[PDB]
Design a binder for this molecule. Structure first.
Ligand code: GS8
Ligand code: GS8
Ligand code: NA
Ligand code: NA
Ligand code: NA
Ligand code: NA
Ligand code: NA
Ligand code: NA
Lengths: 217, 217
């Protein structure tokens, strides 16, 4: 049988980006673990998939992909329907706003939020490494300034790209989910339109399914 | 058909990403400078274009965009022809490789190459800031490992996504051009297929036109 394969730990943020997209479009898939403890990500077998030796990678027949956003867009295109059109590529202005807010995640929001996840969650929980409180403080101040902008945006529309959910919103889910596992989760409550947006995403069945994979089973 | 407008200094890397895409598709445009000396990027007029107060921004009628890659994709879609189709969105596997290598620029290549540009070129030439040789050395070692991967890829095809030029290749132009103005330019000679690809991009008429805009006096 023909499920597509995602390679990497299911709970890894960038894997969860891809599995969320797969769930949203109703595609059949399997997640194949990659064991970092044996350097499997640097094995020749995995380097054939991603020559830079990272996860996720992805296989659909003879096509091997890497870079979570590239994988995700392939999925969103391949399995597109009229009812689940998360890129909006037939409407140039809508597609442009999807792209803008996807880029805002990559270049503005995630660089502010991710260090807090690293320092407050990944460091202590993965290998028991310390937290750098200077990094956390600096990042929180940058994140507050980002959230001020998101608060204004999400007072004008229910989602980032307009009055429709899109890949832009989905891209914010994996790292933000882990931010909600840190002691700084309540920050979002100070930006009520951002909180309402987050709650809307968390209510989505595909998001619930992937959130359940981002915990300890 | 009034020309579309690109806002920012013409020689800025992320402005040049956009103007290269505009030249490749033969679109009429104007570059409108944004004066950082008077904080014009933080003025209400510019914040209406990019609420994060960065350049580039872009206007087409009533549409305002920011984030250079989002602007660029809007351009490549709007002005697409069968002859100049730089995203390949009608072919899932080709679009996927364009997307992979666009992501590799953003998340792998540019993070290794751009600090060398900053330390060796932008620091001394813009404000007269010092150079951090530790940053340069660490970045060079990362870049060498990246270039090994590019060398293998560019032995299989003349361009990153396949046997056709695409947005993936164009994304590498602006920072790489400035890297070639640093004392480390010769690094590429150690990767003959990467150097041959670079020379092919530099031979393109659109690339020549934008390279001429990328000067200080
Ligand atoms: N931009 C890429 C990031 C992948 C990545 O960082 N993967 C990490 C796991 S998370 O810190 C990884 O595989 N690292 C191993 C390494 O670099 O050796 C994407 O979105 O796919
Ligand atoms: N990912 C974005 C980066 C734009 C940017 O950094 N712009 C800088 C100029 S270059 O260092 C900028 O406008 N900075 C002003 C500021 O952040 O205050 C893009 O691709 O458009
Ligand atoms: Na849930
Ligand atoms: Na549930
Ligand atoms: Na929860
Ligand atoms: Na001007
Ligand atoms: Na595209
Ligand atoms: Na290859």
């Amino acid at each position: 049988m023909a499920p597509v394969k995602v390679f990497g730990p299911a709970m890894s943020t960038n894997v969860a980006r891809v599995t969320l997209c797969l769930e949203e479009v109703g595609a059949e898939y399997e997640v194949v673990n990659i064991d970092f403890n044996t350097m499997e990500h640097k094995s020749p077998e995995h380097l054939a998939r991603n020559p830079f030796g990272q996860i996720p990678a992805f296989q659909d027949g003879d096509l091997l992909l890497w870079e979570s956003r590239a994988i995700s867009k392939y999925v969103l295109r391949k399995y597109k329907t009229d009812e689940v059109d998360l890129l909006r590529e037939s409407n140039l202005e809508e597609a442009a706003m999807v792209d803008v807010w996807t880029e805002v995640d990559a270049h503005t929001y995630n660089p502010a939020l991710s260090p807090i996840v690293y320092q407050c969650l990944f460091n202590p929980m993965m290998r028991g490494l310390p937290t750098d409180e200077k990094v956390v403080a600096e990042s929180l101040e940058k994140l507050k300034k980002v959230l001020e902008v998101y608060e204004a945006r999400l007072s004008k529309h229910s989602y980032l790209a307009g009055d429709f959910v899109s890949f832009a919103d989905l891209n914010h889910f994996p790292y933000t989910f882990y931010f909600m596992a840190t002691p700084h989760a309540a920050l979002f409550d100070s930006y009520p339109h951002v909180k309402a947006w987050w709650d809307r995403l968390m209510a989505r069945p595909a998001v619930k399914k992937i959130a359940a994979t981002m915990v300890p089973p």
